[PDB]
Amino acid sequence: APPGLVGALPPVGFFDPAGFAAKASPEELSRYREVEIMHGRFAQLAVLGFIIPEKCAYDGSFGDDFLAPTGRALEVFNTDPLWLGLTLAVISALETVRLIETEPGTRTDAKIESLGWRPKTESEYINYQVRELQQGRLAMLAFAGEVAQELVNDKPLLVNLQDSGFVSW
Amino acid sequence: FENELGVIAPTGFFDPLGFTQDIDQEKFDQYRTAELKHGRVAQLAVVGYVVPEFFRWGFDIAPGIACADVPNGVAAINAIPALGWAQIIFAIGAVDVRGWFGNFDIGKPDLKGKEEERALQELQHGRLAMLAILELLRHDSQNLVKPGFDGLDNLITGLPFLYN
Amino acid sequence: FENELGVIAPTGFFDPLGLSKNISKEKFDEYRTAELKHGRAAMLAVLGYIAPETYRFGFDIAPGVSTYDIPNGVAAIDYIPALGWAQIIFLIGAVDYWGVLGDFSFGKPDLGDKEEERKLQELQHGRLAMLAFLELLRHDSQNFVSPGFDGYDKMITGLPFMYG
Ligand code: CLA
Ligand SMILES: CC(=O)O[C@H]1CC(C)(C)C(=C=C/C(C)=C/C=C/C(C)=C/C=C/C=C(C)/C=C/C=C(\C)C(=O)C[C@@]23O[C@]2(C)C[C@@H](O)CC3(C)C)[C@](C)(O)C1
Ligand SMILES: CC1=C(C#C/C(C)=C/C=C/C(C)=C/C=C/C=C(C)/C=C/C=C(C)/C=C/[C@@]23O[C@]2(C)C[C@@H](O)CC3(C)C)C(C)(C)C[C@H](O)C1
C-alpha cells in the first residue's frame, strides 16, 4: 500500500484509514512527511518541558511562586506573559532562518552532520528515522492529552496522578 | 556480526549505538562472554532474592549472626563480616577463572538438535533477569536510604503471597 | 628449567619437592607469574603493616568510620564495611586482569644491560618479603586471638624505636 515512506511498523502496519496517501501528489506526500517530523520534534520538546518545570514546582525547588496558583505549566499565561511572548518571538526568528535557508522538500535537514553523531551503516539509519517518527507521534498524543486534562481540572500532571489514586507516592 | 546467536524478534539486531561497528571476532567474543556471565549472575540473583523470603538455611554464617536473622535485600552486605564476604568472593573467582568445582562432565548434556534454540533461550532469560535485578536493587536501596519514597511496602513487591 | 632466571649462590636451583619436573614451559611461565605477583604483594604488605603504626592518613573510609581509630593488621578487616572492601577488591582486579591504571608506558624503563639483573633482584626481594609477611601475620593473628601470647605485646617488635 505505501509508496516507500520509511514509516509503517509491526504494531499496526500502514495506518491510513481516511485515504490521504492515495489522493495526494508526489510532492504532497513529501510535505505530509515533513509536517509529521516537525510536529513530532516540537511536541517531544514540549512534553519534556511540561514534565520538568511542573515537577520542579512539586518539589519546592524553584521557590514558592514558580507556577503560583496551581502549578500548571499553562499558568505562565498568567505569571510572566511577556517572557512567553519573547520566547515565541525568538523561536519565530530562528524558524524564519529555517524558512529562508532550507528549500522546499528539505525543511528537516539542519546540515548538522559533524556537530553530532549518526549511525554508520544504512539499515540502522532507516531504523533511526522510524524511531524519530514514532517518538514524535507518541509525543503529539501526549501533549494534546496534557493540555486538555490541565484545562479540564486545574491540577498538575503528577498531582492528578497522586490524587485519584493512580500512583503510590 | 549481524548473524550470530542473539538475533531474535522483535528487534532483529539491537546495536543502536554502534558498538559492533569496527571490531574483530575477539572483541565480540569478549562481549558475548560478558553478556552470558552477567545474565547467569542476574538470574541466580533474582532467585536468591525470592527464596530467602520463605526459607533460610539452618547454619550460622559468621561467628554469631546466624543465617535466620540477616536482612534480605541490599542489606546483608553490611551484616556479614567482611572476611567472610571476601572469602566467598575469592571462591566464586576460583570457580570463575580456574573453573574448578564447576566443570563436571555431567553438566554438559547432549542437547540433541536443539542446541542453538537453547543457547538463544538462555541468553534471552539472561537479558530479562538483568532488568529484573536492576528493578529489585533500585526498589530496595531507595526504600532503605529513605523508608518509603515508593509507597509500595515490602521487598518483593509483586508477589504479595509471601507477605513481603 | 635449571637455567631460567632465579638461581643465585645460596641454594642454586631450589626445587626440593620436585614441583617443577616434567612441567611444560607454559606452566613454568604461570608459576613465575604467580611468584612475581605474590612477591610484589608481599612487599607492599610488609610495608603496609609498618606505616600505620605511626601515621594514619586521615580520611573516612566509610560513612562513620575514620582511619584514625581502626586498629592495624588482621583487625582492620572487620572494621571497614564489607561493601567498601568489595569495591576495592574489584578495582584491584580491574588493574590486574584488564590492565588499567597500571600500564603507563613511561613506568616501564629500559634497563638495557641490566634487565637480567634487576629482575633477579626483584624476585629475590619478593621471596624474602613473602616470609616477612608470613611472620608478621603469625604474630598479628596469634596475638589478636589470645592477647599477650609470645609476650612481645607490640607489633613491629624488631623496630623498637618506632614504639610499635
Ligand atoms: C576474586 C574473585 C573473582 C575473580 C578472580 C574473577 C575473575 C573474572 N571475572 Mg568475575 N565475578 C566474581 C568474582 C571474581 N571474578 C563475583 C563474585 C561476581 C559476582 C557474581 C563476578 C561477576 C563477573 C561478571 C559479571 C563478569 C566477570 C568477569 C571476570 C573476568 C575478568 C573481569 C574481572 O574480574 O575484572 C573485574 C573488572 C571490573 C571493571 C570490575 C567491575 C566492577 C563492577 C562494575 C562494580 C562492582 C560492584 C561492587 C564492587 C560489588 C558488589 C557485589 C558483591 C558484594 C557481590 C575474570 C575471569 C567478566 C568476564 O567474564 O569477562 C568480561 C564479566 O563480565 N565476573
Ligand atoms: C545537536 C547536534 O549537533 O546533534 C544532535 C542531533 C540530534 C538528532 C538532534 C540528537 C538527538 C536526538 C534527540 C534530541 C532525541 C530526543 C528525543 C526525545 C526528547 C523524545 C521524547 C519523547 C517523549 C515522549 C514520547 C513523551 C511521552 C509521554 C507520554 C507518553 C505520556 O503519557 C505523558 C503523560 O502526560 C500524559 C499524556 C498523561 C498524563 O496524565 C500522564 C503522563 C505525564 C505520563 C543529538 C543526539 O542530541 C545530537
Ligand atoms: C596489607 C594488608 C593486608 C594484607 C595483605 C596481604 C595481601 C598479604 C599477603 C600475604 C602473602 C601474599 C603471603 C604469601 C606467602 C607465600 C609464601 C610464604 C610462599 C612460600 C614458599 C616457600 C616458602 C617455598 C617454596 C618452595 O621451597 C619449596 C617448598 C620447594 C622448592 O622446590 C620450590 C620452592 C622454592 C618454591 C590485609 C591483611 C588484607 C589487611 C591489613 O590491614 C592490610
First to last CA, chain C: 43
CB neighbourhood size of A75 (10 A): 19
Contacts of A30 (CB under 8 A, 6+ apart): A105
DSSP string, A102-153: S-TT-SS----SSSS---SSSHHHHHHHHHHHHHHHHHHHHHHHHHHHHHHS
- Report domain extents, chain B: 25-162
A12, part of any domain: no
| Residue of C81, C78, C70 lying closest to B76 (CA atoms) | C81
DSSP string for residues in C112-124: -TTTTTHHHHHHH
Alpha-carbon distance A30 to B7, whole Å? Answer: 34
| Nearest by Cα to C40 from C127, C140, C114 | C127
Three-class DSSP category at C26: helix
* CA of residue A151 relative to chain centroid, distance: 19
Q: How far is CA C87 from CA A48, B42, B90, C74, C103, in A?
A: 36, 19, 14, 19, 21
How far is residue A109's CA from residue B115's CA, in Å, rounded to a whole number?
Answer: 47
Asked if B79 and B70 touch (Cβ cutoff 8 Å), the reply is yes
Report the CATH number at residue A104: 1.10.3460.10
Say if A15 falls within a structural domain: no
Question: How many CB atoms sit inside 10 A of residue B136's CB?
Answer: 22
| Amino acid making up residue B97 | V
Which helix (H) or strand (E) segment holds residue B135: the answer is helix B115-145
Identify whether the C-beta of residue B30 lies closer than 8 Å to the C-beta of residue B144.
no
Domain that holds residue A113: 26-165
Documented resolution in Å: 3.2
> In terms of DSSP H, where are the helices of B19-112?
25-50, 82-96
**B154 Rama sector, left if φ>0, alpha if ψ -120 to 50, beta otherwise:** left
Distance CA A54, CA B104 (A): 59
- For chain A, the domain total comes to 1
A133 domain residue, yes or no: yes
Fold of the domain spanning B25-162: Chlorophyll a-b binding protein (1.10.3460)
The verdict on residue A68 lying in a domain is yes
Q: Check residue A12 and report its DSSP letter.
A: S
- Which CA distances in Å does B141 have to B12, B16, B85? 34, 30, 19
DSSP category for residue C71: P
Q: In terms of Cα–Cα distance, which of B14, B50, C73 is closest to A127? A: B14
Q: Is the dihedral of CA A9, A14, A17, A20 positive or negative?
A: positive
How far is Cα B53 from Cα B75, in angstroms, rounded to an integer?
14
Cell of B23: 571490531
Which of A94, A135, A169 for a ligand 2 pocket mutation test, highest count of atoms within 8 Å of Cβ? A135
φ, ψ for residue B38 (rounded to 5)? -60, -45
Distances B85 to B6, B78, B82 between C-alpha atoms, Å:
34, 10, 5
Chain B hits for A124, CB-CB cut-off 8 Å, are: 15-16, 18
- Put simply, the answer to whether B18 touches A124 (Cβ < 8 Å) is yes
The CA B96 to ligand 1 mean position distance, Å, reads 9
Helix (H) or strand (E) holding A38: helix A26-58
CA of A143 to the centre of ligand 2 (A): 11
**Start-to-end Cα distance in chain B:** 44
Contact B83 C78 (CB under 8 A): yes
C-alpha cell at C110: 629500559
Residues from chain B that touch C82, judged by Cβ atoms under 8 A, are 77-78, 80-82, 85-86
User: Does residue A38 belong to any structural domain of this protein?
Assistant: yes
Give B-chain residues touching C89 at CB under 8 angstroms.
Answer: 86, 89
Contact B86 C80 (CB under 8 A): no
- Chain position carrying cell 504532497: A28
CA dihedral (A56, A58, A63, A66) in degrees, to 10, reads: 80
- Is A20 within a domain? no
